[PDB]
Ligand SMILES: C[C@@H]1O[C@@H](O)[C@@H](O)[C@H](O)[C@@H]1O[C@@H]1O[C@H](CO)[C@H](O)[C@H](O)[C@H]1O
């Protein structure tokens with residue numbers, strides 16, 4: 001398992017599954033991504049050992065982003081947003097976690113807030129799956 | 142394969158740390174406690190072909206010796222006083238400055254080491270010998 005002096009990795013293979021030491025107190029995850037036509041959805045999960053704190057799901061089949069989470073392994077209430085992505089275009093997607101709110105930006109502009117339902121301090125894994133190519137992934141605490 | 146856990150605690154010696162991104166400004170910070178288990182310990186910063194810096198604390202000789210390899214053979218030593226005592230805690234930091242690695246102990250400059258081969262491609266840190274590692278941290 002390799003680490004980086006800049007906490008950044010290029011061209012990781014999907015599905016990407018990357019350990020992280022919590023995701024709170026101002027942690028930022030920056031992804032440069034290209035949604036693909038290989039699947040009609042892709043998602044990013046910020047997972048603790050027990051639950052998903054945030055599941056961010058881009059859905060080209062439904063024309064939406066769906067955010068949700070699990071508690072005791074069951075899905076909670078969905079937040080639905082417009083889909084800010086187009087397949088085969090490049091996006092910089094950032095998540096920023098502080099004070100129980102995970103703020104989400106696309107190409108530098110605020111896209112949505114997610115009010116977490118389980119503490120993001122317990123996050124231990126960043127998972128990226130589905131119809132998406134990850135060009136780069138970076139975490140700053 | 143890859144991890145954003147750039148700081149970790151209490152790894153067992155010997156520690157093998159696969160790394161990338163050792164460029165100008167990169168900093169390795171270790172909190173260590175030398176032990177009586179062996180009269181020496183060392184830190185190697187390696188590329189896939191050579192040791193860029195072998196930092197070796199020696200309680201038997203009363204010195205730190207720095208060196209490097211070319212084609213697997215040792216080059217010329219730099220020898221310094223030993224700043225460490227067994228069973229005391231030290232923060233040891235190595236900073237790449239794009240050709241000179243600057244080494245600090247407890248926040249004070251200890252020594253510079255002039256690289257004998259470029260270190261851009263350092264891919265592996267090893268920590269071995271009579272030392273307990275409380276933490277390792279890579280950053281800029
Ligand atoms: C299970 C429901 O089925 C579909 O028709 C969706 O429109 C709903 O959102 C549900 O899908 C599930 O939604 C969760 C998040 O709430 C996950 O995205 C899961 O992958 C998806 O199957």
Ligand SMILES: C[C@@H]1O[C@@H](O)[C@@H](O)[C@H](O)[C@@H]1O[C@@H]1O[C@H](CO)[C@H](O)[C@H](O)[C@H]1O
Nearest residue numbers: 195197202206207208209215216217218
């Ligand atoms: C082989 C030499 O043995 C003693 O004379 C030491 O005082 C010298 O420093 C040499 O020791 C070797 O030094 C290299 C670095 O030049 C490595 O530390 C190696 O482990 C050590 O045996």
Ligand SMILES: [Mg+2]
Nearest residue numbers: 037038039040
């Ligand atoms: Mg399919």
Ligand SMILES: [Mg+2]
Nearest residue numbers: 165166237238
């Ligand atoms: Mg500089």
Ligand SMILES: [Mg+2]
Nearest residue numbers: 165166238239
């Ligand atoms: Mg400089």
